[PDB]
Amino acid sequence: KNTGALEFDSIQVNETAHLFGDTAKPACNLTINFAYPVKSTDNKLKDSLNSYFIAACFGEGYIGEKPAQVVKEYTEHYVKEYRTDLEPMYAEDEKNKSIGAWYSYYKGIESHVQLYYKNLLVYRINYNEYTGGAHGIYMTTFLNMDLINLRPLKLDDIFTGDYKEALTDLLWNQLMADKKVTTHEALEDMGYGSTGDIAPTENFYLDKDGITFYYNVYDITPYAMGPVEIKIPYEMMEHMLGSNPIIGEMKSK
Amino acid sequence: KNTGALEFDSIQVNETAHLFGDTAKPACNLTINFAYPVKSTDNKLKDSLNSYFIAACFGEGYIGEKPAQVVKEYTEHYVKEYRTDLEPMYAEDEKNKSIGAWYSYYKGIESHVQLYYKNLLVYRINYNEYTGGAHGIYMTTFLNMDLINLRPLKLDDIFTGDYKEALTDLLWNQLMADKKVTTHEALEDMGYGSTGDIAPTENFYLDKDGITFYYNVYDITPYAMGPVEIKIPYEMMEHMLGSNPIIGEMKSK
Ligand SMILES: [Cl-]
Ligand SMILES: [Cl-]
């Protein structure tokens, strides 16, 4: 029933590497929880999906390798990037002298299958990083894998013609409803749209009810307000939607 | 088709709190990505599931509150636990004097729906923590929510009679096959069973093929080897399996 009859597993990595290999010294901490297809009745589709998941989580340079190898190389690269940069920096800050908490680094990459129905595979990537400073950054990314065309769906695969201005107004109208307000200013006073206009984003995901547009920190709100989701039901976009059978499959579910 | 027709969403929290509220000082960093049911055609089932997910991710003290409230209280508690303990400790280490990297703390809690088919809901919790030291700890926990009995499945809900000794031998036999070896000693020389016997764990998950027993770091291998999964197909346990309709539903899928 589901395209490629995909089965998944994950690779977990958790590494603490201290400067100078000394436990009393600052460390970098890496966490990987990577979901990837292990079995398929279409290995072409399996290789395609693995390439996109690896490219999105770790980078294009890692294409062609087994995920276990990718995660190993990625982990070594991160530790060596950290040590070769921060060890001479720490020795310098020490030569002058207490040194700061500017040397404790964290990077987390988690990915899992959010939805897998008929010709659609929704892959969610959670990313977080801290390199000293007041705070770090955290991001949620989505891939809407078209299991026929073996590529992620973009807005111009889901919408016909010139829809940017139209979708912008739908997004504003929906957020106004969610926050029980009747003005752009009322939303703006709550901080929505205070870092910029609520334009449609390529960071979205499909589900049985509609399209959820996912705004990461800074996109439309200040960092401190966190991410924000704006969901548009399919019923409100009927005439704007494309011919891709995934749209019909989502609407039917 | 799926019991309670459940719809899910998540609460994301990312907080950096520095000692003395000073960016130049060490910090604690908390990450929460909590999945919870938002909509159901059986609100009794929805409240039950929310209680278990909150209890498992944050603790029993948080039962009865909305997940947004829970995550807020949990975050404040973590920051205050950190500051009220480590601020006088840091002031003391400073009074003597450079101070260590013993003060950079990290805690991550992520949860998501792994499987939701008919009367079964498999909930995966990913936990990680670092409090200084050579390394931290990371754990993956599973809840096999029985959507009829409104509680997680335990081994004695899935197996009949005295199955511990039997399951132990199945687990050893399966790991031997996975690592292409014919002795307990051959596995032991690879480190498997070097921290203790491979007894059945309550940390398992059901899927269309069988039961995956999830061993966290230290359970049966040294920390450095990471977690290990041992999957037993339903075909190899046919006569040992109980009457719970979820077993039949998994076997049929
Ligand atoms: Cl180290
Ligand atoms: Cl702070």
Cβ neighbours for A246, distance < 8 A, ≥ 6 positions apart: A118, A119, A120, A144, A146, A153, A206
Q: Is residue A67 classed exposed, middle or buried when 0-12, 13-18 and 19+ CB atoms within 10 A define those classes?
A: buried
Of B103, B110, B128, the CB nearest to A14: B128
Residue B18: list chain A partners with CB under 8 A. Answer: 134
Per DSSP bridges, beta strands B105-117 and B151-152 are: unpaired
Q: Rounded distance, CA B156 to CA B164, Å?
A: 10
Choosing among 2.60.40.730, 3.90.640.20, 3.90.1150.10, 3.30.450.40, the CATH entry for B154-253 is 3.90.640.20
**Which residue is associated with the tokens 């909305």?**
B66
Residues B94, B88: Cα–Cα separation, whole Å: 10
List, as ranges, residues 188-207 from B with C-beta within 8 Å of A. none
Q: Which residue has the tokens 């006088």?
A: B88
Q: How far is the CA of A21 from the centre of ligand 1 (A)?
A: 4
Preceding-residue numbers of gaps in chain B (C–N over 2.5 Å): 97
Q: Which residues of B touch A112 (CB under 8 A)?
A: 112, 114, 124
**If you ran DSSP here, which 8-state letter would residue B14 be given?**
E
Distance CA B240, CA B236 (A): 9
Residue A52: is it exposed, middle or buried by C-beta count within 10 angstroms (0-12/13-18/19+)? Answer: middle
Q: Give the orientation angle of helix A43-57 with respect to helix A67-96, to 10 degrees.
A: 10
Beta bridge partners of B204: B213
- Locate the chain A residue with the closest alpha carbon to B228: A12
CB A34 within 8 A of CB A10: yes
- Beta-carbon neighbour count of residue B185 at 10 Å? 10
Distance in angstroms (rounded) separating the CA atoms of residues A48 and A40? 11
Q: Which chain B residues have a beta carbon less than 8 Å from that of A226? A: 12-14
Q: Using CA atoms of A70, A71, A74, A79 in order, give the dihedral in degrees to the nearest 10.
A: -150
- In one-letter notation, the amino acid at residue A190 is M
- What Rg do the C-alpha atoms of chain B give, in angstroms? 22
The Cα B196–Cα B172 span in angstroms is: 12
Name residue A81's amino acid: E
User: B1-153 belongs to which homologous superfamily?
Assistant: Fervidobacterium nodosum Rt17-B1 like (3.30.565.40)
Q: Do A198 and A172 touch, CB atoms closer than 8 A?
A: yes
Q: Rounded to an integer, what is the distance from CA B197 to the centroid of its chain?
A: 21
Q: Any residues with CB less than 8 A from the CB of B9 and at least 6 apart, and which? A: B35, B36, B38
Within 8 A by CB and 6+ apart from B100, the residues are A24, B93, B132
- Sheet with A228-233: list strands edge to edge: A204-206, A210-215, A228-233
Amino acid at A189: D
Q: Burial level of A150, CB count in 10 A (0-12/13-18/19+)?
A: middle
Radius of gyration of chain A (CA): 22
**The sheet that has B7-18: what strands, in order across it?**
B7-18, B27-39, B105-117, B120-130, B137-146, B151-152
Token duo for residue B200: 């059945």
Measured in angstroms, the CA of A25 and the nearest CA of chain B are apart by 6
Q: Does B100 touch chain A (CB under 8 A)?
A: yes
**DSSP-based three-state secondary structure for B214:** strand
Q: How far is the C-alpha of A193 from the C-alpha of A188, rounded, in Å? A: 6
Strands B105-117 and B27-39, by their bridges, are parallel
**What are the phi and psi torsion angles at B180 (to 5°)?**
45, 50
Residue A41 touches partner B, C-beta closer than 8 Å: no
Token couple for A120: 């659609």
Q: Quick check: B204 and B215 in contact, CB under 8 A?
A: no
Ligand 1 center–CA A18 separation, angstroms:
4
CB contact under 8 A, A29 and B106: yes
Q: Which residues have their alpha-adjacent CB atom under 5 A from ion ligand 2?
A: B 17-18, 21
A24 close to B101: Cβ distance less than 8 angstroms? yes
Q: What is the largest CA-CA distance in chain A?
A: 67
Rounded distance, CA B168 to CA B201, Å? 10
C-alpha span between A121 and A148 (Å, rounded): 11
Residue B191 Cα distances to A212, B54, B164, B220, angstroms: 46, 35, 22, 8
User: What separation in Å is there between the alpha carbon of B53 and the centre of ligand 2?
Assistant: 29
Q: B128–A226: do the CB atoms touch at under 8 Å?
A: no
CA A76 to chain centre: 22
Between the CA of residue B154 and those of A66, B143, B159, B205, what are the distances in Å?
35, 9, 9, 10
The answer to whether the Cβ–Cβ distance between A112 and B108 falls below 8 Å is no
> Which experiment gave this structure?
X-ray
Resolution to one decimal, Å: 2.3
Q: Please answer yes or no on whether B128 and A103 come within 8 Å at the CB atom.
A: no
Q: How far apart are alpha carbons A186 and A181 in whole angstroms?
A: 6
User: In whole angstroms, what is the distance from residue B132 CA to residue A101 CA?
Assistant: 12
Cβ contacts of residue B163 below 8 Å, gap of 6+?
A: B155, B200, B240
Q: Locate the domains of chain B by residue range.
A: 1-153, 154-253
Task: Scan for tokens 């003597």, then name that residue.
Answer: B96
| Cα–Cα distance, B161 to B241 (Å, whole number) | 10
First to last CA, chain A: 13
Q: Whose structure tokens read 């770090």? A: A136
C-alpha triplet B178, B122, B163: angle, nearest 5°: 55
Contacts of A11 in chain B (CB under 8 A): none
Token pair for A212: 């959820």
One-letter amino acid of A38: V
**Hey, are the CB atoms on B135 and A16 less than 8 Å from each other?**
yes
Which residue is it, tokens 């499987």?
B115
Phi, psi dihedral angles at A154 (to 5 degrees): -110, 170
- Locate the chain B residue with the closest alpha carbon to A223: B14
- Cα–Cα distances in Å, from A60 out to A15, A85, A144? 23, 23, 18
Is residue B12 within 8 angstroms of chain A, CB to CB?
Answer: yes
- A16: three-class secondary structure by DSSP: strand
Q: Would you say A120 and A147 are in contact if contact means Cβ atoms under 8 Å apart?
A: yes
Nearest to B104 among A12, A104, A217 (CB): A104
Residue whose tokens read 């460390």:
A27
Partner residue facing A101 (CB), from B104, B108, B136: B104
Angstrom distance (rounded) from CA A216 to CA A142:
11
Residues A97 and B98 sit within 8 Å (Cβ to Cβ) = yes
Contacts of A86 in chain B (CB under 8 A): none
For residues A132 and A103, what is the distance between their CA atoms, to the nearest angstrom?
A: 6
Nearest ligand atom owner, CA of A133: 2
Provide, as residue numbers in chain A, all residues whose Cβ is less than 8 Å from the Cβ of B130: 16, 29
